Amino acid sequence: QSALPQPASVSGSPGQSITISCTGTSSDVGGYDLVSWYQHHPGGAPKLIIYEVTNRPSGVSDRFSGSKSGNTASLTISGLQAEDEADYYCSSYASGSTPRIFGGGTRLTVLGQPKAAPSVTLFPPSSEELQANKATLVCLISDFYPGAVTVAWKADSSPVKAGVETTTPSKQSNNKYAASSYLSLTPEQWKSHRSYSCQVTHEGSTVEKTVAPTECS
Amino acid sequence: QSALPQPASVSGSPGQSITISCTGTSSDVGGYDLVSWYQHHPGGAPKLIIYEVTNRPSGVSDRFSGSKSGNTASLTISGLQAEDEADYYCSSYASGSTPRIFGGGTRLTVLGQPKAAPSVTLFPPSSEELQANKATLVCLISDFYPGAVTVAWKADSSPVKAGVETTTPSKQSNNKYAASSYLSLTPEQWKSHRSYSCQVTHEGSTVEKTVAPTECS
């Protein structure tokens, strides 16, 4: 059955208030008082936050409330908090054969959250990695907001992008983002050049950390 | 409410059958014959495929079926096909504050190529980083399929969770996945132990990589 149309996404700021709509028809949202809403943080389990149009399970913040008018239902969130950032869905009892149809979901981004520069950390090819005749440098970028980051490499004060590989900013528990830039090199080209560096640029600023061939007894 | 735990990840090949479980209590799964299963493709709307434990709404193939025994419910998909690949959730009616509790979901992977065991590489704290009174270990996981892994860290045969951040696996060019996990530590904790080890599990198979403070003798 065709889903209940919902805004693909919405954005707000801490303390603000947002409304997410769920468009139904006289056969569902508008035919009964059985509309539910779910909050779902990807990776986690969906959570029932509203049922029977306006019922809010105990344990669910009063900042959330639901309602409907005609064939459209809405979920309103007040005093937006960073933790409200998640996906939200609606569903309704239907007059057809389907016992319950669902909305297509709405991703709610909570902006305004504090900014922060990344704490890049450069690693030299490990001992074992060198065994398999391999050598890769790791530029660990962590605790930064937004997930906006651009990285470059220098081979003895000379830009070299032959072997660069950066990951897509994965979010973390501390809510800040993290990513790693790899430089798949040769145990040959590493034990040759003097020192490799990593230049991470986050929101205008730019940080650098260099590492050179390490050897011991 | 506490999520009804279900397997994080399961895989199957075209034509085979797979079974996913949902664990609950006498207050929910056990207390009613109101278990549901939903199929959800990321980006799309959740689709109800099983309700009332074993009931199947119209339009839904006979390949899907549910059942329960005590406090554990189960979904079975037979004659697997590429399209069945998605996140699956269960839910049950419940007594108490919230009317319906949901499971954490299970990502099903219908094998479309041979499985690739993960290649793991562990990096020790750089001397440079150590100076700044910081200690970070990086664990790299590459070329694995299905794209799911769990990562754990140990200190001389003992668990660790503080400072443990692990990324989401991302699909690579070669159609296989990668991921990484780092562990923040104090140069003390580092030197304080004989060694730390990274444990990666893929499809039940677990491999380890260990590192020791000892750099020079």
PDB file of all heavy atoms in Angstrom, chain A residues 40 45-46 51 89 97 99 102-103 121 123 129 136 142 165 172-173 210 216, chain B residues 40 45-46 48 58 89 99 102-103 123-124 128-129 136 138 165 172 182 216:
ATOM      1  N   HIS A  40      12.952   7.195  15.834  1.00  0.00           N
ATOM      2  CA  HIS A  40      13.920   6.153  15.562  1.00  0.00           C
ATOM      3  C   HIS A  40      15.327   6.648  15.270  1.00  0.00           C
ATOM      4  O   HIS A  40      15.585   7.244  14.226  1.00  0.00           O
ATOM      5  CB  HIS A  40      13.453   5.262  14.402  1.00  0.00           C
ATOM      6  CG  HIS A  40      14.408   4.157  14.083  1.00  0.00           C
ATOM      7  ND1 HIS A  40      15.052   4.052  12.868  1.00  0.00           N
ATOM      8  CD2 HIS A  40      14.874   3.136  14.843  1.00  0.00           C
ATOM      9  CE1 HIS A  40      15.876   3.021  12.895  1.00  0.00           C
ATOM     10  NE2 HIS A  40      15.788   2.450  14.082  1.00  0.00           N
ATOM     11  N   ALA A  45      16.365   0.948  18.336  1.00  0.00           N
ATOM     12  CA  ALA A  45      15.035   0.400  18.119  1.00  0.00           C
ATOM     13  C   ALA A  45      14.017   1.516  18.019  1.00  0.00           C
ATOM     14  O   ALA A  45      14.140   2.530  18.684  1.00  0.00           O
ATOM     15  CB  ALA A  45      14.659  -0.524  19.267  1.00  0.00           C
ATOM     16  N   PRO A  46      13.000   1.344  17.170  1.00  0.00           N
ATOM     17  CA  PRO A  46      11.973   2.381  17.033  1.00  0.00           C
ATOM     18  C   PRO A  46      11.332   2.566  18.399  1.00  0.00           C
ATOM     19  O   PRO A  46      11.276   1.630  19.185  1.00  0.00           O
ATOM     20  CB  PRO A  46      10.996   1.774  16.029  1.00  0.00           C
ATOM     21  CG  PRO A  46      11.896   0.890  15.188  1.00  0.00           C
ATOM     22  CD  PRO A  46      12.777   0.241  16.223  1.00  0.00           C
ATOM     23  N   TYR A  51       0.234   7.654  20.283  1.00  0.00           N
ATOM     24  CA  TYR A  51      -0.708   6.673  19.766  1.00  0.00           C
ATOM     25  C   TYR A  51      -2.124   7.202  19.978  1.00  0.00           C
ATOM     26  O   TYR A  51      -2.368   8.005  20.876  1.00  0.00           O
ATOM     27  CB  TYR A  51      -0.500   5.303  20.441  1.00  0.00           C
ATOM     28  CG  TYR A  51      -0.767   5.249  21.929  1.00  0.00           C
ATOM     29  CD1 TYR A  51      -1.943   4.671  22.428  1.00  0.00           C
ATOM     30  CD2 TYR A  51       0.155   5.772  22.845  1.00  0.00           C
ATOM     31  CE1 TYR A  51      -2.195   4.615  23.793  1.00  0.00           C
ATOM     32  CE2 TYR A  51      -0.088   5.725  24.219  1.00  0.00           C
ATOM     33  CZ  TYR A  51      -1.266   5.146  24.686  1.00  0.00           C
ATOM     34  OH  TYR A  51      -1.523   5.108  26.041  1.00  0.00           O
ATOM     35  N   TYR A  89       8.389   8.739  12.297  1.00  0.00           N
ATOM     36  CA  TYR A  89       7.392   8.132  11.424  1.00  0.00           C
ATOM     37  C   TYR A  89       5.997   8.182  12.012  1.00  0.00           C
ATOM     38  O   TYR A  89       5.809   8.265  13.231  1.00  0.00           O
ATOM     39  CB  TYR A  89       7.699   6.644  11.168  1.00  0.00           C
ATOM     40  CG  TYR A  89       9.017   6.340  10.526  1.00  0.00           C
ATOM     41  CD1 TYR A  89      10.205   6.440  11.245  1.00  0.00           C
ATOM     42  CD2 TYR A  89       9.084   5.966   9.188  1.00  0.00           C
ATOM     43  CE1 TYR A  89      11.436   6.179  10.643  1.00  0.00           C
ATOM     44  CE2 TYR A  89      10.311   5.700   8.570  1.00  0.00           C
ATOM     45  CZ  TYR A  89      11.478   5.810   9.304  1.00  0.00           C
ATOM     46  OH  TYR A  89      12.687   5.574   8.697  1.00  0.00           O
ATOM     47  N   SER A  97      -7.747  -3.348   3.627  1.00  0.00           N
ATOM     48  CA  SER A  97      -7.294  -4.621   4.179  1.00  0.00           C
ATOM     49  C   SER A  97      -6.071  -4.521   5.084  1.00  0.00           C
ATOM     50  O   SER A  97      -5.931  -5.316   6.012  1.00  0.00           O
ATOM     51  CB  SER A  97      -7.000  -5.595   3.043  1.00  0.00           C
ATOM     52  OG  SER A  97      -5.945  -5.101   2.231  1.00  0.00           O
ATOM     53  N   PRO A  99      -3.892  -3.767   8.044  1.00  0.00           N
ATOM     54  CA  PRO A  99      -4.208  -3.353   9.416  1.00  0.00           C
ATOM     55  C   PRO A  99      -3.582  -2.017   9.848  1.00  0.00           C
ATOM     56  O   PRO A  99      -4.129  -1.325  10.710  1.00  0.00           O
ATOM     57  CB  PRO A  99      -3.763  -4.555  10.263  1.00  0.00           C
ATOM     58  CG  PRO A  99      -2.811  -5.292   9.392  1.00  0.00           C
ATOM     59  CD  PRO A  99      -3.349  -5.130   8.001  1.00  0.00           C
ATOM     60  N   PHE A 102       2.140   2.847   7.079  1.00  0.00           N
ATOM     61  CA  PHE A 102       3.137   3.761   7.600  1.00  0.00           C
ATOM     62  C   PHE A 102       3.536   4.932   6.733  1.00  0.00           C
ATOM     63  O   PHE A 102       3.401   4.908   5.511  1.00  0.00           O
ATOM     64  CB  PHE A 102       4.389   2.966   7.980  1.00  0.00           C
ATOM     65  CG  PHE A 102       4.187   2.064   9.154  1.00  0.00           C
ATOM     66  CD1 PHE A 102       3.439   0.899   9.028  1.00  0.00           C
ATOM     67  CD2 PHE A 102       4.687   2.409  10.404  1.00  0.00           C
ATOM     68  CE1 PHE A 102       3.186   0.092  10.134  1.00  0.00           C
ATOM     69  CE2 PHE A 102       4.442   1.610  11.520  1.00  0.00           C
ATOM     70  CZ  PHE A 102       3.689   0.452  11.387  1.00  0.00           C
ATOM     71  N   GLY A 103       4.042   5.963   7.401  1.00  0.00           N
ATOM     72  CA  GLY A 103       4.482   7.152   6.714  1.00  0.00           C
ATOM     73  C   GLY A 103       5.878   6.869   6.233  1.00  0.00           C
ATOM     74  O   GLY A 103       6.524   5.960   6.747  1.00  0.00           O
ATOM     75  N   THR A 121      45.464  12.944  14.595  1.00  0.00           N
ATOM     76  CA  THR A 121      46.546  12.140  15.157  1.00  0.00           C
ATOM     77  C   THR A 121      47.154  11.301  14.038  1.00  0.00           C
ATOM     78  O   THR A 121      46.467  10.486  13.430  1.00  0.00           O
ATOM     79  CB  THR A 121      46.024  11.180  16.239  1.00  0.00           C
ATOM     80  OG1 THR A 121      45.210  11.899  17.170  1.00  0.00           O
ATOM     81  CG2 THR A 121      47.183  10.533  16.974  1.00  0.00           C
ATOM     82  N   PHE A 123      49.602   8.385  12.524  1.00  0.00           N
ATOM     83  CA  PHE A 123      50.224   7.107  12.850  1.00  0.00           C
ATOM     84  C   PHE A 123      51.155   6.636  11.739  1.00  0.00           C
ATOM     85  O   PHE A 123      50.872   6.827  10.558  1.00  0.00           O
ATOM     86  CB  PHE A 123      49.152   6.036  13.058  1.00  0.00           C
ATOM     87  CG  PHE A 123      48.432   6.136  14.366  1.00  0.00           C
ATOM     88  CD1 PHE A 123      47.239   6.844  14.465  1.00  0.00           C
ATOM     89  CD2 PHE A 123      48.938   5.512  15.501  1.00  0.00           C
ATOM     90  CE1 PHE A 123      46.558   6.928  15.675  1.00  0.00           C
ATOM     91  CE2 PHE A 123      48.263   5.589  16.717  1.00  0.00           C
ATOM     92  CZ  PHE A 123      47.072   6.298  16.803  1.00  0.00           C
ATOM     93  N   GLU A 129      52.275  -4.453   9.863  1.00  0.00           N
ATOM     94  CA  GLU A 129      51.835  -4.014   8.548  1.00  0.00           C
ATOM     95  C   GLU A 129      53.021  -4.069   7.587  1.00  0.00           C
ATOM     96  O   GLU A 129      52.859  -4.357   6.399  1.00  0.00           O
ATOM     97  CB  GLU A 129      51.288  -2.589   8.612  1.00  0.00           C
ATOM     98  CG  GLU A 129      50.536  -2.177   7.363  1.00  0.00           C
ATOM     99  CD  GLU A 129      50.177  -0.707   7.350  1.00  0.00           C
ATOM    100  OE1 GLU A 129      50.658   0.036   8.231  1.00  0.00           O
ATOM    101  OE2 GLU A 129      49.418  -0.295   6.450  1.00  0.00           O
ATOM    102  N   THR A 136      50.963   1.718   5.675  1.00  0.00           N
ATOM    103  CA  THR A 136      49.934   2.744   5.559  1.00  0.00           C
ATOM    104  C   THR A 136      49.910   3.687   6.752  1.00  0.00           C
ATOM    105  O   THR A 136      49.925   3.254   7.905  1.00  0.00           O
ATOM    106  CB  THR A 136      48.525   2.119   5.411  1.00  0.00           C
ATOM    107  OG1 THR A 136      48.455   1.372   4.190  1.00  0.00           O
ATOM    108  CG2 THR A 136      47.454   3.205   5.402  1.00  0.00           C
ATOM    109  N   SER A 142      39.260  13.265  15.050  1.00  0.00           N
ATOM    110  CA  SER A 142      38.144  13.016  15.951  1.00  0.00           C
ATOM    111  C   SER A 142      37.625  14.250  16.675  1.00  0.00           C
ATOM    112  O   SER A 142      38.263  15.301  16.667  1.00  0.00           O
ATOM    113  CB  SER A 142      38.547  11.974  16.988  1.00  0.00           C
ATOM    114  OG  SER A 142      39.571  12.481  17.827  1.00  0.00           O
ATOM    115  N   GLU A 165      43.031   8.471   0.747  1.00  0.00           N
ATOM    116  CA  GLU A 165      41.714   7.881   0.958  1.00  0.00           C
ATOM    117  C   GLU A 165      41.115   8.332   2.284  1.00  0.00           C
ATOM    118  O   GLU A 165      41.605   7.975   3.353  1.00  0.00           O
ATOM    119  CB  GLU A 165      41.812   6.359   0.930  1.00  0.00           C
ATOM    120  CG  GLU A 165      40.487   5.655   1.130  1.00  0.00           C
ATOM    121  CD  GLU A 165      40.612   4.163   0.944  1.00  0.00           C
ATOM    122  OE1 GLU A 165      41.423   3.545   1.667  1.00  0.00           O
ATOM    123  OE2 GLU A 165      39.904   3.609   0.075  1.00  0.00           O
ATOM    124  N   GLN A 172      29.457  10.302  16.345  1.00  0.00           N
ATOM    125  CA  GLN A 172      29.896   9.584  17.541  1.00  0.00           C
ATOM    126  C   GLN A 172      28.964   9.728  18.735  1.00  0.00           C
ATOM    127  O   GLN A 172      27.896  10.331  18.640  1.00  0.00           O
ATOM    128  CB  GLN A 172      31.289  10.050  17.955  1.00  0.00           C
ATOM    129  CG  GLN A 172      32.344   9.872  16.892  1.00  0.00           C
ATOM    130  CD  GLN A 172      33.739  10.147  17.418  1.00  0.00           C
ATOM    131  OE1 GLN A 172      34.042  11.252  17.884  1.00  0.00           O
ATOM    132  NE2 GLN A 172      34.601   9.137  17.351  1.00  0.00           N
ATOM    133  N   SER A 173      29.388   9.165  19.864  1.00  0.00           N
ATOM    134  CA  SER A 173      28.609   9.227  21.097  1.00  0.00           C
ATOM    135  C   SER A 173      28.632  10.653  21.631  1.00  0.00           C
ATOM    136  O   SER A 173      27.602  11.203  22.025  1.00  0.00           O
ATOM    137  CB  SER A 173      29.188   8.269  22.144  1.00  0.00           C
ATOM    138  OG  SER A 173      30.528   8.603  22.465  1.00  0.00           O
ATOM    139  N   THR A 210      53.143  15.839  11.469  1.00  0.00           N
ATOM    140  CA  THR A 210      54.062  15.117  10.601  1.00  0.00           C
ATOM    141  C   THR A 210      54.679  13.920  11.308  1.00  0.00           C
ATOM    142  O   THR A 210      54.813  13.909  12.531  1.00  0.00           O
ATOM    143  CB  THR A 210      55.202  16.024  10.122  1.00  0.00           C
ATOM    144  OG1 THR A 210      56.124  16.231  11.198  1.00  0.00           O
ATOM    145  CG2 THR A 210      54.659  17.373   9.676  1.00  0.00           C
ATOM    146  N   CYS A 216      64.621   1.586  15.734  1.00  0.00           N
ATOM    147  CA  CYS A 216      65.232   1.378  17.041  1.00  0.00           C
ATOM    148  C   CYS A 216      66.045   0.088  17.129  1.00  0.00           C
ATOM    149  O   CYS A 216      66.125  -0.682  16.170  1.00  0.00           O
ATOM    150  CB  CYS A 216      64.151   1.371  18.123  1.00  0.00           C
ATOM    151  SG  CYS A 216      64.207   2.815  19.230  1.00  0.00           S
TER     152      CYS A 216
ATOM    153  N   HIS B  40      11.772  -3.007   6.570  1.00  0.00           N
ATOM    154  CA  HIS B  40      12.140  -1.624   6.319  1.00  0.00           C
ATOM    155  C   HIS B  40      13.441  -1.504   5.555  1.00  0.00           C
ATOM    156  O   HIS B  40      14.489  -1.967   6.005  1.00  0.00           O
ATOM    157  CB  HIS B  40      12.272  -0.847   7.631  1.00  0.00           C
ATOM    158  CG  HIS B  40      12.636   0.592   7.442  1.00  0.00           C
ATOM    159  ND1 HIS B  40      13.658   1.203   8.138  1.00  0.00           N
ATOM    160  CD2 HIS B  40      12.104   1.548   6.645  1.00  0.00           C
ATOM    161  CE1 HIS B  40      13.737   2.471   7.778  1.00  0.00           C
ATOM    162  NE2 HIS B  40      12.806   2.705   6.873  1.00  0.00           N
ATOM    163  N   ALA B  45       9.512   3.578   3.715  1.00  0.00           N
ATOM    164  CA  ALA B  45       8.570   3.468   4.803  1.00  0.00           C
ATOM    165  C   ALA B  45       8.565   2.047   5.338  1.00  0.00           C
ATOM    166  O   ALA B  45       8.750   1.098   4.596  1.00  0.00           O
ATOM    167  CB  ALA B  45       7.173   3.841   4.326  1.00  0.00           C
ATOM    168  N   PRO B  46       8.368   1.888   6.648  1.00  0.00           N
ATOM    169  CA  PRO B  46       8.342   0.541   7.219  1.00  0.00           C
ATOM    170  C   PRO B  46       7.105  -0.151   6.657  1.00  0.00           C
ATOM    171  O   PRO B  46       6.081   0.491   6.463  1.00  0.00           O
ATOM    172  CB  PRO B  46       8.186   0.796   8.721  1.00  0.00           C
ATOM    173  CG  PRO B  46       8.697   2.211   8.908  1.00  0.00           C
ATOM    174  CD  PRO B  46       8.169   2.912   7.690  1.00  0.00           C
ATOM    175  N   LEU B  48       4.433  -3.331   7.276  1.00  0.00           N
ATOM    176  CA  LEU B  48       3.957  -4.372   8.196  1.00  0.00           C
ATOM    177  C   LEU B  48       3.799  -5.684   7.412  1.00  0.00           C
ATOM    178  O   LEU B  48       3.063  -5.729   6.427  1.00  0.00           O
ATOM    179  CB  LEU B  48       2.614  -3.963   8.792  1.00  0.00           C
ATOM    180  CG  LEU B  48       1.958  -4.995   9.705  1.00  0.00           C
ATOM    181  CD1 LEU B  48       2.771  -5.140  10.989  1.00  0.00           C
ATOM    182  CD2 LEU B  48       0.515  -4.578  10.011  1.00  0.00           C
ATOM    183  N   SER B  58      -2.684  -9.031   3.691  1.00  0.00           N
ATOM    184  CA  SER B  58      -2.756  -9.286   2.258  1.00  0.00           C
ATOM    185  C   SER B  58      -1.607  -8.600   1.514  1.00  0.00           C
ATOM    186  O   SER B  58      -1.056  -7.602   1.980  1.00  0.00           O
ATOM    187  CB  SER B  58      -4.105  -8.805   1.717  1.00  0.00           C
ATOM    188  OG  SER B  58      -4.363  -7.474   2.126  1.00  0.00           O
ATOM    189  N   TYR B  89      12.147  -5.607  11.814  1.00  0.00           N
ATOM    190  CA  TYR B  89      11.884  -5.337  13.209  1.00  0.00           C
ATOM    191  C   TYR B  89      10.705  -6.156  13.690  1.00  0.00           C
ATOM    192  O   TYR B  89       9.894  -6.615  12.891  1.00  0.00           O
ATOM    193  CB  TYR B  89      11.575  -3.854  13.397  1.00  0.00           C
ATOM    194  CG  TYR B  89      12.717  -2.928  13.040  1.00  0.00           C
ATOM    195  CD1 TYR B  89      12.976  -2.592  11.711  1.00  0.00           C
ATOM    196  CD2 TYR B  89      13.538  -2.387  14.031  1.00  0.00           C
ATOM    197  CE1 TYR B  89      14.017  -1.743  11.375  1.00  0.00           C
ATOM    198  CE2 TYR B  89      14.582  -1.537  13.704  1.00  0.00           C
ATOM    199  CZ  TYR B  89      14.815  -1.219  12.373  1.00  0.00           C
ATOM    200  OH  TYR B  89      15.837  -0.363  12.041  1.00  0.00           O
ATOM    201  N   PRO B  99       2.215   0.976  25.239  1.00  0.00           N
ATOM    202  CA  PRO B  99       1.396  -0.048  24.587  1.00  0.00           C
ATOM    203  C   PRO B  99       2.163  -1.045  23.720  1.00  0.00           C
ATOM    204  O   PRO B  99       1.805  -2.212  23.665  1.00  0.00           O
ATOM    205  CB  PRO B  99       0.417   0.773  23.752  1.00  0.00           C
ATOM    206  CG  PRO B  99       0.318   2.047  24.476  1.00  0.00           C
ATOM    207  CD  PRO B  99       1.741   2.316  24.858  1.00  0.00           C
ATOM    208  N   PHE B 102       9.362  -2.238  20.744  1.00  0.00           N
ATOM    209  CA  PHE B 102      10.014  -2.684  19.515  1.00  0.00           C
ATOM    210  C   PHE B 102      11.399  -3.304  19.728  1.00  0.00           C
ATOM    211  O   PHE B 102      12.057  -3.072  20.747  1.00  0.00           O
ATOM    212  CB  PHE B 102      10.121  -1.506  18.536  1.00  0.00           C
ATOM    213  CG  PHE B 102       8.790  -1.066  17.968  1.00  0.00           C
ATOM    214  CD1 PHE B 102       7.881  -0.355  18.750  1.00  0.00           C
ATOM    215  CD2 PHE B 102       8.423  -1.409  16.662  1.00  0.00           C
ATOM    216  CE1 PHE B 102       6.621   0.004  18.244  1.00  0.00           C
ATOM    217  CE2 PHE B 102       7.176  -1.056  16.149  1.00  0.00           C
ATOM    218  CZ  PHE B 102       6.270  -0.352  16.942  1.00  0.00           C
ATOM    219  N   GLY B 103      11.829  -4.099  18.753  1.00  0.00           N
ATOM    220  CA  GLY B 103      13.133  -4.730  18.825  1.00  0.00           C
ATOM    221  C   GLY B 103      14.152  -3.828  18.163  1.00  0.00           C
ATOM    222  O   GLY B 103      13.782  -2.897  17.457  1.00  0.00           O
ATOM    223  N   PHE B 123      47.418  -0.316  15.213  1.00  0.00           N
ATOM    224  CA  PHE B 123      48.483   0.675  15.354  1.00  0.00           C
ATOM    225  C   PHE B 123      48.688   1.085  16.815  1.00  0.00           C
ATOM    226  O   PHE B 123      47.725   1.286  17.559  1.00  0.00           O
ATOM    227  CB  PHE B 123      48.148   1.914  14.527  1.00  0.00           C
ATOM    228  CG  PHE B 123      48.073   1.656  13.054  1.00  0.00           C
ATOM    229  CD1 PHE B 123      46.900   1.189  12.477  1.00  0.00           C
ATOM    230  CD2 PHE B 123      49.174   1.894  12.238  1.00  0.00           C
ATOM    231  CE1 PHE B 123      46.820   0.964  11.100  1.00  0.00           C
ATOM    232  CE2 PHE B 123      49.108   1.675  10.866  1.00  0.00           C
ATOM    233  CZ  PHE B 123      47.928   1.209  10.295  1.00  0.00           C
ATOM    234  N   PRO B 124      49.952   1.204  17.249  1.00  0.00           N
ATOM    235  CA  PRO B 124      50.245   1.598  18.631  1.00  0.00           C
ATOM    236  C   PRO B 124      50.349   3.120  18.717  1.00  0.00           C
ATOM    237  O   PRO B 124      50.386   3.806  17.688  1.00  0.00           O
ATOM    238  CB  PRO B 124      51.602   0.941  18.914  1.00  0.00           C
ATOM    239  CG  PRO B 124      51.861   0.025  17.713  1.00  0.00           C
ATOM    240  CD  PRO B 124      51.169   0.724  16.582  1.00  0.00           C
ATOM    241  N   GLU B 128      55.272  10.609  19.139  1.00  0.00           N
ATOM    242  CA  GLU B 128      54.879  12.009  19.039  1.00  0.00           C
ATOM    243  C   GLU B 128      53.635  12.275  19.886  1.00  0.00           C
ATOM    244  O   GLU B 128      53.589  13.233  20.658  1.00  0.00           O
ATOM    245  CB  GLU B 128      54.595  12.362  17.578  1.00  0.00           C
ATOM    246  CG  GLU B 128      54.272  13.826  17.337  1.00  0.00           C
ATOM    247  CD  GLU B 128      53.905  14.104  15.891  1.00  0.00           C
ATOM    248  OE1 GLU B 128      52.828  13.645  15.446  1.00  0.00           O
ATOM    249  OE2 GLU B 128      54.700  14.774  15.195  1.00  0.00           O
ATOM    250  N   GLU B 129      52.624  11.425  19.734  1.00  0.00           N
ATOM    251  CA  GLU B 129      51.389  11.566  20.498  1.00  0.00           C
ATOM    252  C   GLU B 129      51.645  11.326  21.982  1.00  0.00           C
ATOM    253  O   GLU B 129      51.076  12.000  22.840  1.00  0.00           O
ATOM    254  CB  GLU B 129      50.344  10.572  19.997  1.00  0.00           C
ATOM    255  CG  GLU B 129      49.332  10.174  21.056  1.00  0.00           C
ATOM    256  CD  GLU B 129      48.436   9.053  20.604  1.00  0.00           C
ATOM    257  OE1 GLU B 129      47.453   9.328  19.890  1.00  0.00           O
ATOM    258  OE2 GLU B 129      48.725   7.894  20.956  1.00  0.00           O
ATOM    259  N   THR B 136      46.577   6.885  21.951  1.00  0.00           N
ATOM    260  CA  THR B 136      45.469   6.396  21.142  1.00  0.00           C
ATOM    261  C   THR B 136      45.847   5.197  20.278  1.00  0.00           C
ATOM    262  O   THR B 136      46.870   5.206  19.593  1.00  0.00           O
ATOM    263  CB  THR B 136      44.925   7.502  20.206  1.00  0.00           C
ATOM    264  OG1 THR B 136      44.568   8.654  20.980  1.00  0.00           O
ATOM    265  CG2 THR B 136      43.696   7.006  19.455  1.00  0.00           C
ATOM    266  N   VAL B 138      44.646   2.557  17.206  1.00  0.00           N
ATOM    267  CA  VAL B 138      43.742   2.477  16.072  1.00  0.00           C
ATOM    268  C   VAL B 138      43.661   1.066  15.515  1.00  0.00           C
ATOM    269  O   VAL B 138      44.684   0.428  15.245  1.00  0.00           O
ATOM    270  CB  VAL B 138      44.166   3.439  14.942  1.00  0.00           C
ATOM    271  CG1 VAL B 138      43.424   3.108  13.662  1.00  0.00           C
ATOM    272  CG2 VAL B 138      43.847   4.852  15.339  1.00  0.00           C
ATOM    273  N   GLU B 165      35.636   4.172  20.543  1.00  0.00           N
ATOM    274  CA  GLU B 165      34.779   4.677  19.474  1.00  0.00           C
ATOM    275  C   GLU B 165      35.022   3.848  18.211  1.00  0.00           C
ATOM    276  O   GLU B 165      36.166   3.677  17.782  1.00  0.00           O
ATOM    277  CB  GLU B 165      35.088   6.152  19.177  1.00  0.00           C
ATOM    278  CG  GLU B 165      34.807   7.123  20.319  1.00  0.00           C
ATOM    279  CD  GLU B 165      33.345   7.149  20.745  1.00  0.00           C
ATOM    280  OE1 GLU B 165      32.460   7.355  19.885  1.00  0.00           O
ATOM    281  OE2 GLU B 165      33.084   6.971  21.952  1.00  0.00           O
ATOM    282  N   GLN B 172      33.158  -0.148   0.052  1.00  0.00           N
ATOM    283  CA  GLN B 172      34.291   0.320  -0.712  1.00  0.00           C
ATOM    284  C   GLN B 172      34.045   0.157  -2.198  1.00  0.00           C
ATOM    285  O   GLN B 172      32.989  -0.322  -2.622  1.00  0.00           O
ATOM    286  CB  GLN B 172      35.551  -0.445  -0.304  1.00  0.00           C
ATOM    287  CG  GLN B 172      36.109  -0.021   1.040  1.00  0.00           C
ATOM    288  CD  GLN B 172      36.243   1.490   1.140  1.00  0.00           C
ATOM    289  OE1 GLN B 172      35.310   2.185   1.564  1.00  0.00           O
ATOM    290  NE2 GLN B 172      37.397   2.012   0.728  1.00  0.00           N
ATOM    291  N   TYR B 182      38.987   3.237  17.426  1.00  0.00           N
ATOM    292  CA  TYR B 182      40.136   3.729  18.154  1.00  0.00           C
ATOM    293  C   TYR B 182      39.824   3.691  19.631  1.00  0.00           C
ATOM    294  O   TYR B 182      38.663   3.618  20.029  1.00  0.00           O
ATOM    295  CB  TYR B 182      40.528   5.142  17.690  1.00  0.00           C
ATOM    296  CG  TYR B 182      39.534   6.256  17.964  1.00  0.00           C
ATOM    297  CD1 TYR B 182      39.431   6.836  19.230  1.00  0.00           C
ATOM    298  CD2 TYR B 182      38.725   6.755  16.944  1.00  0.00           C
ATOM    299  CE1 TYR B 182      38.547   7.890  19.474  1.00  0.00           C
ATOM    300  CE2 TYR B 182      37.838   7.808  17.177  1.00  0.00           C
ATOM    301  CZ  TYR B 182      37.756   8.369  18.440  1.00  0.00           C
ATOM    302  OH  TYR B 182      36.886   9.409  18.667  1.00  0.00           O
ATOM    303  N   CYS B 216      61.319   0.192  22.074  1.00  0.00           N
ATOM    304  CA  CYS B 216      62.774   0.124  21.958  1.00  0.00           C
ATOM    305  C   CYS B 216      63.421  -0.616  23.129  1.00  0.00           C
ATOM    306  O   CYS B 216      62.973  -0.501  24.272  1.00  0.00           O
ATOM    307  CB  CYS B 216      63.342   1.544  21.860  1.00  0.00           C
ATOM    308  SG  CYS B 216      62.642   2.530  20.493  1.00  0.00           S
TER     309      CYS B 216
END
